[PDB]
């Protein structure tokens, strides 16, 4: 029945994740993990989703997310890993949209996955030029805004998590922009604040 | 009569604007608003325009402009979205040429639409390389010069609005170029000043 | 007996190789070498092949291959030389299929022929556009997969040689794609990894 | 037998190394040693490797490594030399992987080769801007993590060597980051500590 | 006798060179000099060549070469001029093959002609994209290798001239590739060194 | 005969040097002297060199070197002048290699030319940032090491002059790094000492 198919999906994804994790040259691992996530999104979309099978799908997604985040963090050219992480975020948004919503614990798992992704991406952007870091950060914030719009759940947790992510983004911006003349500080900081305020305004209107 | 068809146009444009605004992936949204603006320009050009139906057309255009500006601001690759903004500016110039001129309140609405477009485009250009920023800004100034050439109204409002826009452009250039060696400062700043001066000179010749 | 005909083939191929090697305008040299390889393959297919005459045929093939590789390396338009290399490796596959398999030393000679061909083709593709380089490399790896499937021998040597060739291709691709925006990196890399993984899977299955 | 082929390889590599070492313009020399190392790894992969021929292969590798390190140190543009050293590290990692493991003395030779490579790379990066230097150092430590994963041997030697190498990296980072505002100190240093801790965690988990 | 025909050829070539040199639009001038060189080659091949008439033929060739080089340098699209220069080099190679060899002074004249051609072509390629410059220089090196193989004379002058040309090409490449990321320099520079080394190996073996 | 051609070269180089010296905008002057030195190198290489014509070639080189050094000292952007001086050093190294060796007086002239070049380079680098000054000095000492390897003569003069140049460079470094925190003093100074010690070691090995 549903249990058998879900467990078969579990096993297949588990073997593929192990195999890709074992490998070297993390960029190829990232591409393979993205393709695995895509085929998994397709298989989930085909199968009928109910409240019974949600936890297993969520933990499969968590396994994929942890493996991909660790592989990306394992060291590579920062810009490449940044775009790979953005595509991962978009695919994960599609995944959570397809999954649906359930008991709060799975939402907590998804939120902590999101937060680990944010931390890893900030850590990777830590070593770029100020302008490139600004571009990566604003695009990444837009991606999180799209995700938070897609997610369904109790507003308080979503708002608090988004505000916390915003605080980390702003703190890193203040850290990094210190090595430029303050005119560039004004420029980039104003851009980042405006985009993050726009994201906040949408999330507030949507979840108000 | 005229009221019926104008209100029908209002309704269709409103529904299309809502539908496209709801959507994600803002670039396709800008494409859709461009096509809607084109077909609306066509429909208005076809219909006989009188003083009675002008305010409704003006507010329809204002709805279109606010939706497009907000969508462009909502985050994307700056260069693509800014080129879309330039195309929107050209189509808006065609639209205002088609509409004609009337009581001052509309003209104020069009001027603040222009202002929102300019601020949003400067905001988009805030996070580019200095050379690409200068290209975008000079093209933008050319587009606004064309628009101000097209518009008809009281001289004081047009001249003051153009001088204001020029001041924002100059201030943004002064902010952004500060991150380069002063020779490039001289080069790019001289180019921007000369093109903005040419724009001022035309507006003065034609519209004084 | 067999010695007489084999040595006559040796002498004729030697003279033709000398004459073609002496000439300039390398493209006609590769064309003539391809025609020589075709007449040689027909002659070998006609003659009965046993373990006694194998080494002489193998060294004749090695002479032809070294001459062709050196002439191709001697400088020409890269894309034309890549086409000639593809035809050459196809005819070489047919040749090794016709020859049969024997003591390990001849297999080592054939493998190092293949590896020299790979190095020369990578060296030639070194100086093209990224997309054209991707096309050349993907066609090349398809040809190598066909060869490795065709060859018979101890699995360990073939698997190790294929892995080394794959790593060479990957290193060159990582070098070359550095001059493009990382989205193109993602695209072209993902294509290359996927085709190389398909080749690896087949060779592993059929040599398993 | 095996001795004859191994000694022939010894002689050929020796002559090529002498000829390239005699030459000027160290960048071409580094390219030539890279190609020599590639052909040597190919030849070794082809030949059957046993305990008898391991010391000669190891000392050939040591000759190649000393020549390459000395040539890189002999003066050039630092950043190009850094990427050349990274490519050499990757190729020599594949070389030790192909060689296999044996009596401890050869492992000592490989470890001191690695350590001299690290010292040379640190010395070359000594004269770069802080951000670049950080990028070069993190990429280099990722390469060393890959190597230390690849090598097999006694745990204590590998763990101690990696810890010492990490300490040299950290000491250089501390010395170099002194010429920046402390915010950039925080940023870059935190990135370096995090990546080095990731390397340590893998080595400990996999190899402990 | 021979003197009469040689002087008539001198006069005809002189008049045609004057007329083509007077004209503007340098590309048609280059085409005209190419056709003049071809017809002069045919005429020389028809006439019997002895030691008596060699200097006059050599100075006619020098006149043609100086006129063509000056016209090519006089400004045009770089790629078109490079193509024309390669065709000119091939035709002049055929010409010197037809002429034969003689007293050292004429060989010095031919060598300085080749040096001027190399300088002009390098100066023209000075203003191209790095990849296109690499293609132009590799084609140039192939053409010079063909010429140096064709020429007969004392080995020392040929070897020294080839080494000097190689050093000029290397210096220019070291200038040009400095504007690209170091991976691109690795790639293109490795290609250039490898092709120049192949050219050196041939000229050394052939002419040693 | 030899005197005639050598004196013609003398006159031509003299006129070109005077003409370029008269001109302002010293950067174009350095470019012109570089091209003159290149063509002079070619012309000398073509001509047969003997002990009879050596002094005239040496004094021509001295004229060119004094003119170039004076023009470089005459004021320009320091970094551009530094790169031009390095290229001049490489070209003059090629020139002296072409010239050969002779009576001690010409060697003294060449050595004093070298020393004046070094003094001018230090004087120009006197007004740069500490890191840029370090890069200029390291590249420059590498170039002088290459030259000293190239030159042939009595060991005592070469060793003494190199030691004196090392003392000059070291004294200038102790001057320049005085305005930095002592950690940067340690870093850059250690780099300089290590590089200059490696240069000394080579010189001792080759010339001992
Ligand atoms: Zn899919
Ligand atoms: Zn990790
Ligand atoms: Zn339309
Ligand atoms: Zn918005
Ligand atoms: Zn060759
Ligand atoms: Zn290889
Ligand atoms: Zn050294
Ligand atoms: Zn001219
Ligand atoms: Zn030259
Ligand atoms: Zn002066």
Q: Which two tokens stand for residue C85?
A: 């290399």
Separation CA B127–CA A186 (nearest Å): 12
- Residue C30 tokens, joined: 């590769």
Identify which of A152, A145, A82 has the alpha carbon closest to the alpha carbon of residue A117: A82
| Sign of the torsion angle spanned by Cα atoms C136, C138, C142, C147 | positive
Residue C197, classified by CB atoms within 10 Å of its CB into exposed (0-12), middle (13-18) or buried (19+), is middle
Distance from C-alpha of B30 to C-alpha of B10, rounded to nearest angstrom = 19
Instruction: Give the chain B residue nearest A133 (alpha carbons).
Output: B127
How many Å apart are CA F84 and CA F89, to the nearest integer?
A: 9
Asked if E185 and E177 count as a contact pair (C-beta separation under 8 A), the reply is yes
- Cα–Cα dist A196/A191, whole Å: 9
DSSP string, F106-144: HHHHHHHHHHHHHHHHHHHHTTS-HHHHHHHHHHHHHHH
Which residues does chain C have within 8 Å of residue E190's beta carbon, measured at their own beta carbons?
126
List the alpha helices (DSSP H) in chain F: 2-22, 26-46, 54-73, 78-99, 104-125, 130-150, 155-176, 182-207
**Which of F206, F204, F199, F192 is CA-nearest to residue D74?**
F199
Nearest residue to B113 via CA among B160, B60, B75, B74: B60
CB of D83 within 8 Å of a chain C CB? The answer is no
| Helix C155-176 with D78-99: angle, nearest 10 deg | 170
CA dist C162 and B124 (Å) reads 49
Task: Write phi, then psi, for D126 (nearest 5 degrees).
Answer: -55, -20
**Total length of chain C:** 208
| Resolution number, Å | 3.6
- CA–CA gap between residue E177 and residue E175 (Å, rounded): 6
Q: Using an 8 Å Cβ cutoff, are A79 and C180 in contact?
A: no
Q: Does residue E96 sit in helix, strand or coil?
A: helix
CA of B186 to the centre of ligand 10 (A): 30
CA distances D88 to A129, C126, D59, D84, D117, Å, are 27, 19, 17, 6, 9
**Interchain proximity C127–E191, CB inside 8 Å:** yes
Question: Helix, strand, or coil here: B23?
Answer: coil
Rounded to the nearest angstrom, the distance between the alpha carbon of E107 and the centre of ligand 2 is: 66
| Among chain A residues, CA nearest to D135 | A127
In three-state form (DSSP H/G/I as H, E/B as E, the rest C), the secondary structure along chain A is: CHHHHHHHHHHHHHHHHHHHHHCCCHHHHHHHHHHHHHHHHHHHHHCCCCCCCHHHHHHHHHHHHHHHHHHHHCCCCHHHHHHHHHHHHHHHHHHHHHHCCCCHHHHHHHHHHHHHHHHHHHHHHCCCCHHHHHHHHHHHHHHHHHHHHHCCCCHHHHHHHHHHHHHHHHHHHHHHHHHCCHHHHHHHHHHHHHHHHHHHHHHHHHHC
- B24 contacts chain A (CB < 8 A): yes
- Round to whole Å and give the CA distance between A151 and A107: 9
**How does DSSP assign B163-208, residue by residue?**
HHHHHHHHHHHHHHGGGS-HHHHHHHHHHHHHHHHHHHHHHHHHH-
Task: Take residue A56 and report the two structure tokens written for it.
Answer: 């297993």
Residue of F nearest to E164 (CA): F42
Helix (H), strand (E) at residue F53? none
Q: How far apart are CA D17 and CA C108, in angstroms?
A: 25
E208 close to E155: Cβ distance less than 8 angstroms: yes
List the single best residue of D132, D150, D187 to mutate versus A (max A Cβ within 10 A): D187
Question: Both tokens of residue C13?
Answer: 């191929």
Shortest CA distance to B143 belongs to which of B208, B193, B195? B195
Give the residue from E119, E23, E102 showing the smallest Cα distance to E65.
E119
- Ligand 1 mean position, distance from CA A36 (Å): 9
Nearest C-alpha in C relative to E150: C24
Q: What contacts 24+ positions apart, CB below 8 Å, involve C188-197? A: C188/C130, C188/C131, C188/C134, C189/A27, C189/A28, C189/A31, C190/A31, C191/C134, C191/C138, C192/C134, C192/C137, C192/C138, C193/A28, C193/A31, C193/A32, C194/A31, C195/C138, C195/C141, C195/C142, C196/C141, C196/C166, C196/C169, C196/C170
**Cβ <8 Å between A191 and B73:** no
The position carrying tokens 């290399």 is C85
What is the chain E residue with the closest CA to F1?
Answer: E105
B129 and A131 in contact by Cβ < 8 A? yes
C-alpha to C-alpha distance for E162 and F45, rounded to whole angstroms: 11
Q: Any idea which ligand is nearest the CA of A26? A: 2
Instruction: Say which experimental method was used.
Output: cryo-EM
What sign does the dihedral F131-F132-F133-F139 (CA atoms) show? positive
* φ, ψ dihedrals at D11, nearest 5°: -60, -45
Q: Please report how the helices D78-99 and D54-73 are oriented relative to each other, as an axis angle in degrees rounded to 10.
A: 180
Provide CB contacts within 8 A for F163, sequence distance 6+: F200
**Cβ–Cβ below 8 Å for C157 and D46:** yes
Q: Which two tokens stand for residue E13?
A: 């070539």
**Cβ contacts (< 8 Å) between A133 and chain D: which residues?**
none
Q: Are D75 and F142 in contact (CB under 8 A)?
A: yes
The rounded distance, in Å, linking the Cα atoms of A196 and B79 is: 19
Residue pair B148/B207 in contact by the 8 Å Cβ criterion: yes
Chain D residues lying within 8 Å of A24, measured CB to CB = 146
Alpha-carbon span E192 to E135, nearest angstrom: 9
Cα D174 to Cα D84: distance, rounded to the nearest angstrom: 25
Residue pair C28/C68 in contact by the 8 Å Cβ criterion: no
User: How many Å apart are CA B108 and CA B55, to the nearest integer?
Assistant: 12
Please judge whether F94 and E167 are an interchain contact, meaning their C-beta atoms are less than 8 angstroms apart: yes
Q: C-alpha distances in angstroms, D121 versus D21, D82, D116, D158, F36?
A: 19, 6, 9, 20, 39
What tokens does B190 get?
A: 């001289």
Residue from F12, F45, F48 whose CB has the most chain E CBs within 10 Å, to mutate: F45
- Phi first, then psi, for residue C191 (nearest 5°) are -60, -45
Which CA distances in Å does E182 have to C175, D180, F153?
9, 26, 38
Radius of gyration of chain B (CA): 18
Strands (DSSP E) contained in chain B are none
Q: What is d(CA E149, CA D147) in angstroms, rounded to the nearest whole number?
A: 47
* Contacts with D93 from chain A: Cβ below 8 Å: none
CB distance E186–D84 less than 8 Å?
Answer: yes
How remote is the C-alpha of D179 from its chain's centroid?
28
Q: How far apart are CA E202 and CA E208, in angstroms?
A: 10
Give the Å distance between the CA of D199 and the centre of ligand 2.
7
C-alpha distances in Å from residue D197, one per residue of B179, D103, D170, D191, F30: 35, 30, 11, 10, 52
What is the DSSP code (8-state) at residue B101?
-
Burial D19-48 (b: 16+ CB within 10 A, else e): ebbeeeebbbbbbbbbbbbbbbbbbbbbbe
Radius of gyration of the CA atoms of chain A, in A: 18
Residues with a beta carbon under 5 angstroms from ion ligand 2: A 70, 74; D 198
* Helix, coil or strand: residue D138: helix
Angle at CA C193, nearest 5°, toward D114 and C201?
Answer: 100
The Cα–Cα gap between D125 and E181 comes to 17
Closest Cα to residue B77, out of A114, A165, A170, C181? C181
Mind spelling out the 3-state secondary structure of chain C?
CHHHHHHHHHHHHHHHHHHHHHCCCHHHHHHHHHHHHHHHHHHHHHCCCCCCCHHHHHHHHHHHHHHHHHHHHCCCCHHHHHHHHHHHHHHHHHHHHHHCCCCHHHHHHHHHHHHHHHHHHHHHHCCCCHHHHHHHHHHHHHHHHHHHHHCCCCHHHHHHHHHHHHHHHHHHHHHHHHHCCHHHHHHHHHHHHHHHHHHHHHHHHHHC
Evaluate whether chains D and A are touching (3 or more beta carbon pairs less than 8 Å apart): yes
Nearest alpha-carbon partner for E146 in E80, E87, E104: E87
Q: Are D94 and D37 in contact, with CB atoms under 8 Å apart?
A: no
- How far, in Å, CA of C63 to CA of F12, rounded? 54
d(CA F32, CA F12): 14
Compute the count of residue pairs across chains A and B with CB atoms less than 8 Å apart. Answer: 41
- C-alpha to C-alpha distance for C110 and A106, rounded to whole angstroms: 58
Note whether C33 and C67 are within 8 A (CB).
yes
Element holding E111 (H helix, E strand):
helix E104-125
Phi and psi, residue A155, nearest 5° = -60, -35
Residue D171's SS3 state is: helix
């Amino acid at each position: 029945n549903v249990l058998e198919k879900v467990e078969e999906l579990k096993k297949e994804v588990k073997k593929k994740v192990e195999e890709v994790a074992k490998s070297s040259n993390v960029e190829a691992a990232l591409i393979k993990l993205l393709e695995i996530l895509d085929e998994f999104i397709h298989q989930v979309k085909l199968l009928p989703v109910n409240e019974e099978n949600r936890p297993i799908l969520v933990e499969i997604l968590e396994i994929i997310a942890n493996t991909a985040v660790h592989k990306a963090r394992d060291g590579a050219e920062p810009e490449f890993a940044l775009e790979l992480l953005l595509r991962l975020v978009e695919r994960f948004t599609e995944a959570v949209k397809a999954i649906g919503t359930s008991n709060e614990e799975e939402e907590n798992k998804l939120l902590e996955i999101l937060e680990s992704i944010a931390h890893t991406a900030i850590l990777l952007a830590r070593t770029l030029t100020p302008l490139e870091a600004t571009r990566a950060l604003i695009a990444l914030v837009v991606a999180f805004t799209k995700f938070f719009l897609a997610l369904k759940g109790s507003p308080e947790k979503i708002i608090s998590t988004f505000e916390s992510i915003a605080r980390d983004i702003l703190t890193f911006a203040e850290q990094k922009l210190a090595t430029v003349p303050p005119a560039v500080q004004t420029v980039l900081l104003s851009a980042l604040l405006e985009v993050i305020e726009d994201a906040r305004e949408h999330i507030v209107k949507k979840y108000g």
